[model samples]
Target: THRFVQKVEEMVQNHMTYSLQDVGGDANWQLVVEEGEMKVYRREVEENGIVLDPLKATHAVKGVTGHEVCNYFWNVDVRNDWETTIENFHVVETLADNAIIIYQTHKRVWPASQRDVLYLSVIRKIPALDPETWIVCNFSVDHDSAPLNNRCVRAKINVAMICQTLVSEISRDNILCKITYVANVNPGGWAPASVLRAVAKREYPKFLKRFTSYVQEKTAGKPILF
Candidate 1:
């Protein structure tokens, strides 16, 4: 358990550092979806004939702060409500107060088998920055409690949801959350690149939009976290 905890911390640090990575306009990254304040980009990549393109998304949402956005994402209790793609999930181990190992299965898409993931999910506050930031990182790992089953393919993923809170100089209540979500997933089993890319293009934007809205609605009329 101590070794696993160390591994979790190292992975968390890696994701925190990558939260600052620039995903600006570039030829390698293609714009897949753009709606309202949210825009998604992905780089076409392959490893051993597998589509492993990394995804990047940025959005500036009003009426919420980074703390609030991250709170909802990090809370496992509310995950099922927002993560519609997830068929079911459960915590396998508690690494720390702010970290845990989770196993989740996603709803099967047509022409592909159901997929599952076992990962470490962590949440932390970045106080060193001028504008406070909150981040949640989920990376795939092998766990004894949740063994890979033949029923579903075990997917590998490393994802980060970074939120930076921007507050208006005039009013404390006026704030917005600038979000940067990055993910690199390996479908594990053989899935067509065309199909995977198409699914991601549609799902990523939907997930982000629904997630932010859920957080906003859940936090409405409540005191702000930060």
Candidate 2:
């Protein structure tokens, strides 16, 4: 039932390019942290006496090409090495060249039990206005899946997407990539918002640093992927 839908490609293409910029406009998004080259923004919500917010993080790196930064992370094969918060991740089905369905089990984050997630994911490379620029978007879809009610709690991501937009910058006569990563994850279940908020605060920075460092160490002296 989780097979290819031709129309989905066009829908994803347009959505990634046009509609996503409006995410922070009406949501009261706020700039929370400015860590070196990474800027973290978050918006909060209060429900049932707890506060929660989906996160958006952007980072910039020097001496590495943008395509190379993307090459290592986008390849699902190497995710386990870099995705620190994931307990286990694997593809359920690949809907398109840039899209796949994955199921994940998150590492236990105290007070909340372990949880599992299933999502139809897409990765798109949108051509930018500048010929040498790259804009990459990653998101998950609400698609049909079989019964996953084995034991752990099932997490529902009403919306989940990350944009790793690359803007060209050079300093000290070295080329750099301005990496913008925007993400909104709604981990559904009865887990209190306070716990979720704390978890997000603790985990988002780790994701940003670990991912950037991984790319830096892996491609230090090699030729760029592009």
Candidate 3:
């Protein structure tokens, strides 16, 4: 069992760097919403009753240190404070050092069913090559224990969030990060494609902004996590 965990860990780390990726082409993603620093895009396919496309979002933010951003997010306690869409979220178990299994049920949006997602993910503090550089890799893991919820009737989706953290040249405390969030979910039951797409479009941008604000506000007078 432990050997399988190590293999899954290696697999998750490899793609988290964005070293290998191709979402087909420009045709793959349709720009649904652009607000503030966040741009939400989707590569969706109507498969049976489910939305098969992965929602992708990109953005950059400033004001707080990268270490603080990662620590607040990678840890479980502060999640519900900023994650606007979650009704409930908790770490089910910790697999190893920087890896854990998370389970969350999203608030039910009208015309769309409620969702409960379970997946394994990790955050690793990358060793720096020099004094001015820093990087952290975040990714999702697929393991035997993380299979879809077979017992219940809920829209099961697999989600991953990968981000790279960097410290600003002006100050160690002030930092910036490039973030990518991906989601491929199965709606499970019959649902309107329009409502599902709209949820992804509307929710993602606010989610990021809320998250960044939460980080800055909470850590304002506090020391950097690193």
In order, the Cα lDDT scores of the candidates are 0.85, 0.63, 0.62
- Which stretches in model 3 have alpha-carbon errors above 4 Å? 1-4, 17-27, 127-152, 168-174
Q: Which candidate should be chosen as best, given TM-score against the real structure?
A: 1
Kindly give the number of clashing pairs for every candidate.
Answer: 0, 0, 0
Instruction: Please tell me which model should have the higher TM-score, number 1 or number 2.
Output: 1
Model 1: residue 32 alpha-carbon error in angstroms: 1.4
Candidate number that wins on TM-score, 2 or 3: 2
Tens-digit per-residue lDDT, 1-226, candidate 3: 5433675556445545452243436676787777766777787688876666677776666656556666677778777677777776667677777667777677778856576666665555555443321223333334455436543345555455555566642553466665666666776676777887777667777777788778778876665554
Strongest candidate by lDDT: 1
For model 3, what is the C-alpha lDDT against the true structure? 0.62
Per-residue lDDT of 1-226 in model 2, one digit per residue for the tens?
Answer: 2354554455455555543464335446687777887877887865455444766666767666667666666678888878878887768777667667787888888787787777665544556544343444454555556346465676655332333334342332265666656655555556767788778777778888888888788877775555
Using lDDT as the measure, name the better of candidate 1 and candidate 2: 1
Off by over 4 Å in 2: 1-27, 46-52, 131-138, 142-149, 158-173
For TM-score, candidate 1 versus 3, the one ahead is 1
Q: Which ten residues in a row have the lowest lDDT in candidate 2?
A: 164-173
Candidate 2 accuracy as lDDT: 0.63
